[PDB]
Amino acid sequence: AKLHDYYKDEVVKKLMTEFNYNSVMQVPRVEKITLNMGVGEAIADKKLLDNAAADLAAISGQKPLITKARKSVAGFKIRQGYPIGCKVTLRGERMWEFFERLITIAVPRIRDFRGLSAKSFDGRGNYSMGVREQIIFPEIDYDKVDRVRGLDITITTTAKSDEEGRALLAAFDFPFR
Amino acid sequence: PWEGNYSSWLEQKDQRLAQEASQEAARRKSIEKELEWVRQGTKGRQSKGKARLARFEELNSTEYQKRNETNELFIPPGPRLGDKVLEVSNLRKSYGDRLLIDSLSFSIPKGAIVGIIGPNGAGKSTLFRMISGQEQPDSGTITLGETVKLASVDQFRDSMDNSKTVWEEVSGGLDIMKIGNTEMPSRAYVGRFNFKGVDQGKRVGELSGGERGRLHLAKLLQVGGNMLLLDQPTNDLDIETLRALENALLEFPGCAMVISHDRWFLDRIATHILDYQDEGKVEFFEGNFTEYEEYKKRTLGADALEPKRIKYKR
Amino acid sequence: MLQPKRTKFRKMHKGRNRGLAQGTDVSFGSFGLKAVGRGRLTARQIEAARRAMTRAVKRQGKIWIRVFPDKPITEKPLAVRMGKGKGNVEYWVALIQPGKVLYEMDGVPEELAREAFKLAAAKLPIKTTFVTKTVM
Amino acid sequence: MAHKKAGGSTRNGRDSEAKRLGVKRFGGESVLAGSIIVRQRGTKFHAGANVGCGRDHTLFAKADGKVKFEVKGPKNRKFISIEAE
Amino acid sequence: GIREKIKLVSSAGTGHFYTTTKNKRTKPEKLELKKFDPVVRQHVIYKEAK
RNA sequence: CCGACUUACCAACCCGAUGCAAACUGCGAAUACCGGAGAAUGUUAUCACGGGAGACACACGGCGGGUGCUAACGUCCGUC
RNA sequence: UCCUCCUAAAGAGUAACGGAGGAGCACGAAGGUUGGCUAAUCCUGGUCGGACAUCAGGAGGUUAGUGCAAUGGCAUAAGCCAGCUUGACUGCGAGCGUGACGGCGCGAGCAGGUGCGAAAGCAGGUCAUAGUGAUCCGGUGGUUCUGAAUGGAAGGGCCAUC
RNA sequence: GGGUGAUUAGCUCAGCUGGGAGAGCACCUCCCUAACAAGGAGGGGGUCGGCGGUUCGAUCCCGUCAUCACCCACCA
Numbered sequence A: 001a002k003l004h005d006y007y008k009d010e011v012v013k014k015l016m017t018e019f020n021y022n023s024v025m026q027v028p029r030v031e032k033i034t035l036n037m038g039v040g041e042a043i044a045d046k047k048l049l050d051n052a053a054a055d056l057a058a059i060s061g062q063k064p065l066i067t068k069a070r071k072s073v074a075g076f077k078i079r080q081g082y083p084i085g086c087k088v089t090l091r092g093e094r095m096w097e098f099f100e101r102l103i104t105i106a107v108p109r110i111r112d113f114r115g116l117s118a119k120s121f122d123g124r125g126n127y128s129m130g131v132r133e134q135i136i137f138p139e140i141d142y143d144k145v146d147r148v149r150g151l152d153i154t155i156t157t158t159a160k161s162d163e164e165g166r167a168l169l170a171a172f173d174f175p176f177r
Numbered sequence B: 001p002w003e004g005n006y007s008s009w010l011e012q013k014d015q016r017l018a019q020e021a022s023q024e025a026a027r028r029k030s031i032e033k034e035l036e037w038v039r040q041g042t043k044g045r046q047s048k049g050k051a052r053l054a055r056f057e058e059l060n061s062t063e064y065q066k067r068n069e070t071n072e073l074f075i076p077p078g079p080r081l082g083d084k085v086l087e088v089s090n091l092r093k094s095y096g097d098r099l100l101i102d103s104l105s106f107s108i109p110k111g112a113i114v115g116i117i118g119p120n121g122a123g124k125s126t127l128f129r130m131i132s133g134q135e136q137p138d139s140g141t142i143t144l145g146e147t148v149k150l151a152s153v154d155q156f157r158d159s160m161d162n163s164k165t166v167w168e169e170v171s172g173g174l175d176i177m178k179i180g181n182t183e184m185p186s187r188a189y190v191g192r193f194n195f196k197g198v199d200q201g202k203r204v205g206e207l208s209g210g211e212r213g214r215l216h217l218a219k220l221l222q223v224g225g226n227m228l229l230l231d232q233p234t235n236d237l238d239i240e241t242l243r244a245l246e247n248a249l250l251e252f253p254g255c256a257m258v259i260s261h262d263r264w265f266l267d268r269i270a271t272h273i274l275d276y277q278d279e280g281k282v283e284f285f286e287g288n289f290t291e292y293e294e295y296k297k298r299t300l301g302a303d304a305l306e307p308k309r310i311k312y313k314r
Numbered sequence C: 001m002l003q004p005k006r007t008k009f010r011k012m013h014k015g016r017n018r019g020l021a022q023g024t025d026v027s028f029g030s031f032g033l034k035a036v037g038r039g040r041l042t043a044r045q046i047e048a049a050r051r052a053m054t055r056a057v058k059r060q061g062k063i064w065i066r067v068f069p070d071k072p073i074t075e076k077p078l079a080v081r082m083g084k085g086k087g088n089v090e091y092w093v094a095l096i097q098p099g100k101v102l103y104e105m106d107g108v109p110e111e112l113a114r115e116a117f118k119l120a121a122a123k124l125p126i127k128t129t130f131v132t133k134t135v136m
Numbered sequence D: 001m002a003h004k005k006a007g008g009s010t011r012n013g014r015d016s017e018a019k020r021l022g023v024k025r026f027g028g029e030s031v032l033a034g035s036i037i038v039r040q041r042g043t044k045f046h047a048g049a050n051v052g053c054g055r056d057h058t059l060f061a062k063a064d065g066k067v068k069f070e071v072k073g074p075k076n077r078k079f080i081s082i083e084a085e
Numbered sequence E: 001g002i003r004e005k006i007k008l009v010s011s012a013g014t015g016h017f018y019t020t021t022k023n024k025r026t027k028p029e030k031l032e033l034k035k036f037d038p039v040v041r042q043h044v045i046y047k048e049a050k
Numbered sequence F: 001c002c003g004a005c006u007u008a009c010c011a012a013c014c015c016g017a018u019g020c021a022a023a024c025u026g027c028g029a030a031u032a033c034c035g036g037a038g039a040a041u042g043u044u045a046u047c048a049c050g051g052g053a054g055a056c057a058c059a060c061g062g063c064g065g066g067u068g069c070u071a072a073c074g075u076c077c078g079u080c
Numbered sequence G: 001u002c003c004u005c006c007u008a009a010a011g012a013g014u015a016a017c018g019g020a021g022g023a024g025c026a027c028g029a030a031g032g033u034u035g036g037c038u039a040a041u042c043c044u045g046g047u048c049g050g051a052c053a054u055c056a057g058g059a060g061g062u063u064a065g066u067g068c069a070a071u072g073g074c075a076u077a078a079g080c081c082a083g084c085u086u087g088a089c090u091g092c093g094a095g096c097g098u099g100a101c102g103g104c105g106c107g108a109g110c111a112g113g114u115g116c117g118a119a120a121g122c123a124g125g126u127c128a129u130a131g132u133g134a135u136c137c138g139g140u141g142g143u144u145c146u147g148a149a150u151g152g153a154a155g156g157g158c159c160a161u162c
Numbered sequence H: 001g002g003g004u005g006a007u008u009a010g011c012u013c014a015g016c017u018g019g020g021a022g023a024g025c026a027c028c029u030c031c032c033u034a035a036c037a038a039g040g041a042g043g044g045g046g047u048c049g050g051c052g053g054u055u056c057g058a059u060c061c062c063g064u065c066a067u068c069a070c071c072c073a074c075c076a
C-alpha cells in the first residue's frame, strides 16, 4: 500500500534492532482497526442509528455492522437486542488506507489538538482513541449531516506490551502528547 | 332499526345509552350489596345458602363498554413559531392544457387554520404537494419561515404496511417515541389515539376504515411539525372522532391548513378560507365561513341554481 | 440470640440426633467446653451461657461459639387439635452430640476459664466437660 | 365455654402421580429388540451400541441381546449398549 | 385459549382435511402447507378453512 | 466539583481454619431388588385358566420416618 | 383433576387437613433438516457514556441459556444464528413399559409419498416430564356399506371432525 | 382462635391485566380590602404501607408480614 511498504521497511528495520528480535515474525504489527460508535439515543428512533451508520460508512470505506444490546439494562432503559451502535472492522489494505488518511488529514483537524494520550494502552499493546466530533474526517461535507456524533477508534495489534505497542505506533508519526 | 330522521334517531340513541348507563350503575350497586352479604359469616349452624351464592355468581357478568373515541386525539405541540410562516407569490400551475392555479399569492399568519375548499381535482392536493416540496410550481415563490417544521397528512392511506400491528406501524417498534424535544412511551402515545387496550395488537390491514384514519393521524402527527398540512383528515371518521379532532385542532399553538369537503367541520375551525374557483383562480379570504358568506352577500350575484341532474337510463 | 438470616426453607423435619460430633477439638482458643451429653441447645441457652462466660472473665479474653442454631423448631398453638398443617417456628436449636466443643476461650488463665465454663455450663441442658488444647 | 375447640388450614397438600422411572432391564439381562431398558427424564444414561433413544429419552433395545453398562467417553458418562448374545 | 381450531382442506378436490389450531389474531393470513393426501396418495396443497 | 480527612465498623466478595442441611453432593455403604449358573432340600412350594368365596373398621410390638410436646394405649406411612 | 421436588427407608410404589411450587397453555415457527457458532461475570483502555449501553483484548469456563414451576438433562449442544422447507406426513407396526380396568406411554422396522443434505443420513412435532374430559345425544364433510314390496330417499353404519 | 377488607398529597378520597399521578380543601405568592373574611389570578406536594416475586410496566398483578377496621366463634 502507501504505508504498508513504508512500515515494512522503516518500522521493521527499527524494531529488529530495538528489541534484539531473532525473527521478523516477532516484531509486532497492527492487525485491525475497529471504528465504533454507540449511538445510545437510537432508542428514541432508528433514524439516528441509520444516520450514524451513514457517517461511519462515509468515514471508512465499509458498511457498518449494526450492533444490538447484548443484555437488558434497566438503568439505560434498553432491552436485549435493541440496535444500539454501529461498528466497522478494517483489515489489510483498507486498514492501512484509513490509518494513513487519519494520521495525516484527520488528527490535524481536531479542534484544539495538542497530542493523543500515550498512556492509553489496554496492557495488551492495543490502542484506543475518541474523536468527540465526526466532522474531523474530510468525508463529511457539512451539507448532509445533522449532529456531531462522535466516534471511537481501536487499533488492535499483535504486540504483547504497552511499550511494544507504543514503539510500533510511534514509528508511523503518531501525534502523541 | 329506526324510523325517523337523524336528529330524532340521535335523541333515541341518547335515551338508550342513558338507560343502559343507569342499568349498569344499578348492577354495580346490587353486586356490591351482594358481595357485602357474601363476605359475612354463617352466624350459627344456619343456612347462608347456596342459591344466593349461585345468584351472585351469575350476577357477576361482563358488559360491553362503548369504544367511543371522544376527546383524546393528541396533536403534539411543535417548535415555537415565528410570525413569518408561509408565503406564496403569483403561484401558477398547469397540467397539459388545463390549469389549476393561476397567479395566486397569499401569506399565512401564525396560529391560523386555513380551510382549503373547492371542487374535485381543482388543485387542492397539488397545493400541498408544492408546499411540502414534492412538486415544483411554474411561477415558483413558495416560502416558509425558518422556524417552520412541516407535518403532512395525505389524502390517501396507501402508505402503511397492512401486515404490521397497530403499535408497530405507529411507533416503528421502539418502546420510547421521540416527538420533538420530549421522549414519549410508544404504548402511551398509541393509546392516546383510542387504542387504549389490546387494540395495539390489531393488524393494519385488519383495521377498519375509521381506525385506519385514526392510525394514519397517529403515525403522521408524531413528526411534531408546527405547520400541519392535513388533506381530508376526517374521511372515514365518525362524529365523535370528528369532534375530538376539531378540539385538538383548536388547541394547537402552531398553524394548520386543512383540505376538506365537510362545510360544517371546516366552519367550526377555519380562520382563513382558501377557496378554489373556475379558470384556476384560488380566491383567498382571511376570516371564517360566516364572514366569508357575509362578504359574498355584500358583493353577490343574482341567481340560485347549481345543478341539472342529467340522467342514467336511455 | 443466634439465628439464621434468610433461611432457605421455613420449616424442618424433626429428624434424629444420632452419632458422635465432628468439631471435637479445641481449634481456635486454648480451652473449650466439650459437650459430654446429647441433646438440642436452643438459642436462648446459647446466649445465657455466653453472657455468663463474659461476666466471669469481664472484658478480657476472647470467646468463640462453635455451635449455631440453624434448626427451626415449630410449635403448635396452645389448646389446638391435631392436624390442620404444621406448627409455626418458635425458636431455633442446635443439635448437639457427644464430643461437640460448644464454646472456647483464650487469653485468660486456666483457673479462671475453669470457673467461667462452670458458670455457663450451669445454664445448659446437657453434660459438659472442660477440655484444653492439644498438639495433635 | 365457647373456647374448647380450635382449627386452621394449609396451603400445600398436592403432588403428582409417580412415573415409574428407572432401569427396567438390568445389566447382563437378555432382551428382545424394542424392549425398554431405562425410563429416564434427561439422559442419565446415553445410548450405546444397538440401543436407541426415544423422545422421552427412553432407552430401548434396537437388537436382541444382553444389556451392558459402560462409563466410556471423555465426559465419564454412562452408556448402555447391547451385545448380540 | 386464543388458538381457535381450523381445518386445512385439501386442494385435490376430495373432501379430506387435516385439523389444527391457529392464533387468529397474530396470524390472520390463511395457512397453506403441502401435506400428504391419502385419498389421491400425493403430497398436495392444503388451504385453511373454517 | 474532583469527594480531603474519621469506623471502639453492618458487611457478601478471595485465602486459612471450623460447623450445619428432608427438599445441598466434587463422595458413598450394609441391605434390598433385577438377571444368569451351580448343587442340596422342599407332599408343584410357581404360573395359567376355570367354579366358589370372604375381605376392603384392623391392633399392638421391633426397626426407618412424617406429625405431635424428640406427649399419648395419639395419628399417618414402609417393613417384619 | 394434572405436573416437579422432599417425606420415600440407594429397584418400582408408598399416607397424613405433611413441607414447598406450578398447569388448564404457547409456537406455521419457537417444528424438520443442512451449514455455522459458544455463554454468565469481572478486569484494562475507549466521545458524550456513568455502577452498569456499544467497542477492543485479558481472566473465567457454562456460575449462562432453555417459551412458562421444579427436577433430571444438554458442548456431538437439547443453547444462538442463517438458507431451504412442511415428517406438526398417511396405513401399519416386532417388541416393550405402566395401569384393577377404561386407558396411557416408548418404539426399531415395512409400504406409499415428501423435505433438507454432495452423501452417510435425519425428520411420524417442540430437551423431557403439566397444558385436560368417558359415554350418551346431536352437528359438519366424505363413503351407494345398509336402505322394512321394488327403484330412490329418509334414517342408520364406517371414516374424519365439532 | 379462624376469616375478610383497606393502606394513594397535610386531610377526605378518585385512579386503565402499564403509561411523572389526580379532584375538593389545606398550604405558597400576588391582586382586591383601612384591615381580615369571602372573591380573583397564578404555583408547588407523593413511602402509591413495607425488602418480596411470573412481567415490555408493576399503583392497580405477586406470597407475604406491619397497622386499623370489620365478621365469625354454633351443637357444647
Ligand SMILES: Nc1ncnc2c1ncn2[C@@H]1O[C@H](COP(=O)(O)OP(=O)(O)OP(=O)(O)O)[C@@H](O)[C@H]1O
Pocket (backbone or CB within 6 Å): B095, B096, B100, B119, B120, B121, B122, B123, B124, B125, B126, B127, B155
Ligand atoms: N401528473 C399529472 N398529469 C396530469 N394531470 C394530473 C396529474 N396529477 C394530477 N393531475 C390532475 O390535476 C388535477 C389536480 O388534482 P389534485 O390531485 O391536485 O387534487 P384536487 O382535484 O384539487 O382535490 P381532490 O384530491 O380532493 O379531488 C386533477 O384533475 C388530477 O387528475
Ligand SMILES: [Mg+2]
Pocket (backbone or CB within 6 Å): E005, E006, E007, E050
Ligand atoms: Mg372446525
Ligand SMILES: [Mg+2]
Pocket (backbone or CB within 6 Å): none
Ligand atoms: Mg394400617
Ligand SMILES: [Mg+2]
Pocket (backbone or CB within 6 Å): none
Ligand atoms: Mg448443526
Ligand SMILES: [Mg+2]
Pocket (backbone or CB within 6 Å): none
Ligand atoms: Mg418412508
Ligand SMILES: [Mg+2]
Pocket (backbone or CB within 6 Å): none
Ligand atoms: Mg436431494
Ligand SMILES: [Mg+2]
Pocket (backbone or CB within 6 Å): none
Ligand atoms: Mg346414507
